[PDB]
Symmetry: C5
Subunit: 101 residues, 5 copies
């Protein structure tokens, strides 16, 4: 089954934690109307193939250059934290929460 997913990362609330008791498929990352005209970096933190915790950079966005990046359905296994690493925000992430059996 396939549900809408989204989160907002901002100075207030730099992180979103995807957990639960499934797959997230990330679709776009985009800067809100009010973001400072500067580079924003959004990162994902989770476990790699070795079982080590890593931080990976998903996108670098700037309002006057590239305010949206489309990820094409980047599937991630829970758990993952999405975080605004730099830039004012707000930054949005959209995608799907997929459930199977």
């Amino acid at each position: 089954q396939n549900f809408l997913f989204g989160c907002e990362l901002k100075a207030d609330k730099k992180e979103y934690s995807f957990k639960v008791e499934h797959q997230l498929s990330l679709r776009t990352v985009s800067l809100g109307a009010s973001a400072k005209d500067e580079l924003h970096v959004v990162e994902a933190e989770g476990i790699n193939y070795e079982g080590k915790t890593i931080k990976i950079a998903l996108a670098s966005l700037k309002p006057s250059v590239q305010p949206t990046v489309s990820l094409g359905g980047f599937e991630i296994t829970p758990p993952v934290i999405l975080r605004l690493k730099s830039g004012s925000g707000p930054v949005y992430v959209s995608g799907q929460h997929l459930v199977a059996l």
Copy 2:
């Protein structure tokens, strides 16, 4: 699997498009492909959002794209499949914005 074209135009006097379907004996999905700015759009940031129910039963609004005529007038979503009901809305910016995709049955 039938595949039909899908589109809508979001503009100042019509900021929403309601994808709802019903009394079908048939499963419906939309797969969004592009969001694009029309010619007369003000050169300012435009934001299009989707409003629908999440995995935990709560209506949410998610941002699909931020576009700007002089910077990035089209964004490709690559087949963002959404289950009905869903509202697409022009959250901010003037000028008309378009969404294109597919309506699968």
Copy 3:
């Protein structure tokens, strides 16, 4: 399925391209829209015209491009059922549309 190249050129003088077939099932999968070297520095809008799920003919905007801002857009395999018209709603062109014609 098998896979063959698809393309067309749209410009102010040749604004429309009609995609039709007979036969096998056919689908057109669009991949890129791009602006040609000689296109004017202005917005070019490309649209598709074909049927919606209720049988009514609609027109949908595939892409807005401009040589000095975004000369190409990748559609990522936008599958369309024949027949469809592709049209240059605005802009000088030339604009190119590329993709696959899939046959099964």
Copy 4:
């Protein structure tokens, strides 16, 4: 996914405008899946256009434009896996290059 995938790339430039992709009668179905087109560091600031030349479904050779790129506007376009059955020629239709094309050679 499924069958085997190998890396594919070529470079196109003013003095080397074409790359011809052909597969020998070996056994298997072969696909060339195009992933990216990007401009090299040295490329002049002008539009560069890359086209592909191959078979339509009527068996006739056609030329289609894959991407228009410019260093100071849009130096890379991801094609997301535009599969093409060999043979096909990739050509720098306009501009100086260098241009690179990347992708996968798929074998089943």
Copy 5:
């Protein structure tokens, strides 16, 4: 199949990332998702290349992306799968450049 997060950072200090898998019996792929420029990247073209095997078993270098902070800071590759082993390399520019993606395992 399995899907794990993958990432690496390439910069003038460390221009290469080597993706190998310890021989096992299963199919691994590195599926590349995005390449993006870090906060301190200088404003010049950055070019990331991959070096790996072609269909004839010969090692080739192929350019994946060209990025520049004031024109195009991020490129999505949309799941460009490559069979190990592969080196990813900053073929020019300063970096930092980051690559994200998935390490896929099947069979």
